[PDB]
Amino acid sequence: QQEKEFLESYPQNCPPDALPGTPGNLDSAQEKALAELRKLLEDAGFIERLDDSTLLRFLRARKFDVQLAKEMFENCEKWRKDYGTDTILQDFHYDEKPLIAKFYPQYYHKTDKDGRPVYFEELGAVNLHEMNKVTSEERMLKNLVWEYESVVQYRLPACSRAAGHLVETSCTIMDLKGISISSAYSVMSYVREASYISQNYYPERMGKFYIINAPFGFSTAFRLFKPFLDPVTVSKIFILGSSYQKELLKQIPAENLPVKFGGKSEVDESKGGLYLSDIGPWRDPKYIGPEGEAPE
C-alpha cells in the first residue's frame, strides 16, 4: 500500500509546545474522538484522507464535535467530487500567470522559523481591471485550489522533513501597500469565495497571518475589537504598518525573507523575478520524498 509509504516519509508529530489536539499532543478524550470519528467515516465509503492529521484538523475546527466534523468532512468530500480537485493538478493549467502575476502577486517563498511555508500576497497592489482582460474570477479560484493542493501534497511534506517535525500550516503575509476602499470592493467577491474554500475545505491550515503596511487607522481599530475573535485566532493574527521589517524578521529568518521585505533572500530577476518563483524545501533533493517534486 504505497499510500502508507507516504505518511512514513516525513515526521508525524507536531512539536510538543504546539496547541492541544494536534498530532502527537492528544489527551485521551481527543484520542477517543478521533478513533470513533474515523469509524463513522470509514463506515459506508470514505477510504482516503482518513489519516490522523486530516481528521484531527476537522475536529479541531468543530471544537471536537465528532458529529459536526463528520459533516465538514462530508461536505468537503462532496466539494472535491464536484470541483474535481482530486486531479486538479493535472487538468488546470494557469498559463496566464506570467501575464497577470504583476496585477495580483501571489507567491510562496521559503519557510518560517517553525518550518511553515511562507505565502506572500500583495493584495494592496491588486488590479482587477487589468487582470480581467485575460482571466476570470473562476480561473483565479481554480489556481488557488491548485496552490492549495500543491501545498498539501508537496510543500508540507518537504517542510516537515526539513523542520524535523510535522508542519500542517502556512504563514501568510499580506502587503496592503496601495489598498483603497475602491480596490476593497472590487476584490470582495474573490476574497469571499477564497475564504469559503479555505475555511471549510482546508480546515486549520492557517498557521500565521501577517498584515503589513496596513493603513494607520486600521491597526488601532483592530486592537480594540480584538475581544470579538477567538483568543487562538489572535495569536496567529498580526497587524502592522509602514515599519514591519524586523517584526517579520522575528518569525522568518533574513535568509528566508525576501529582500524587499527587509530580508536578504533574493531571486534571479531574469527568470521571472519573485512573482513567478516557487523556491523552498519542496524543490530541494534533501527533502523531496516518494511523491516527487511539485508541478509549476
Ligand X SMILES: O=C(NCc1ccc(N2CCCC2)cc1)c1ccc(F)cc1
Choices 195-203, 213-221, 222-230, 279-287 (CB under 6 A): range interacting with ligand X: 195-203
Q: Residues 75, 87, 180, 195: which binds ligand X (CB under 6 A)?
A: 195
Choices 89-97, 193-201, 243-251, 278-286 (CB under 6 A): range interacting with ligand X: 193-201
Q: Which residues, numbered 198-237, are part of the site for ligand X (CB under 6 A)?
A: 198, 202, 205-206
- Burial class from Cβ neighbours inside 10 Å (0-12, 13-18, 19+) for residue 271 reads exposed
Beta strand 170-175 with 117-121: parallel, antiparallel or unpaired?
A: parallel
> CB 152 → ligand X: shortest distance, Å?
5
Q: Residues 53, 85, 160, 170: which binds ligand X (CB under 6 A)?
A: 170
> CB 237 → ligand X: shortest distance, Å?
11
Choices 1-9, 47-55, 89-97, 188-196 (CB under 6 A): range interacting with ligand X: 188-196
3-state secondary structure of 256: coil
Q: By CB under 6 A, is residue 152 in contact with ligand X?
A: yes
Residue 29 or 196: which CB sits closer to ligand X?
196
CA 84 to chain centre: 19
Cα 189 to Cα 185: distance, rounded to the nearest angstrom: 8
Residue 143 or 265: which CB sits closer to ligand X?
143
Cα 55 to Cα 42: distance, rounded to the nearest angstrom: 12
| DSSP string computed for 62-105 | TTT-HHHHHHHHHHHHHHHHHHT-TTHHHH---TTHHHHGGGS-
Q: By CB under 6 A, is residue 116 in contact with ligand X?
A: no
Cα 30 to Cα 112: distance, rounded to the nearest angstrom: 28
Q: Residues 72, 76, 126, 151: which binds ligand X (CB under 6 A)?
A: 151
Select from 259, 249, 251, 244 the least CA-distant residue to 213. 244
Cα 243 to Cα 28: distance, rounded to the nearest angstrom: 45
- Cell 496547541 sits on residue: 19
Q: By CB under 6 A, is residue 88 in contact with ligand X?
A: no
CA 232 to chain centre: 17
Q: By CB under 6 A, is residue 25 in contact with ligand X?
A: no
Q: Residues 160, 172, 213, 277: which binds ligand X (CB under 6 A)?
A: 172
> CB 271 → ligand X: shortest distance, Å?
25
Residue 278 or 285: which CB sits closer to ligand X?
278
Q: By CB under 6 A, is residue 148 in contact with ligand X?
A: yes
Query: How far apart, in Å, are the Cα atoms of 152 and each of 53, 71, 131, 170, 177?
Result: 11, 21, 27, 10, 29
> CB 53 → ligand X: shortest distance, Å?
12
Most distant CA atoms of the chain, gap in Å: 55
Question: Judged by CB under 6 A, how many residues of this single chain contact ligand X?
Answer: 15
> Interface residues with ligand X (CB under 6 A)?
119, 121, 123, 148, 151-152, 170, 172, 191, 194-195, 198, 202, 205-206
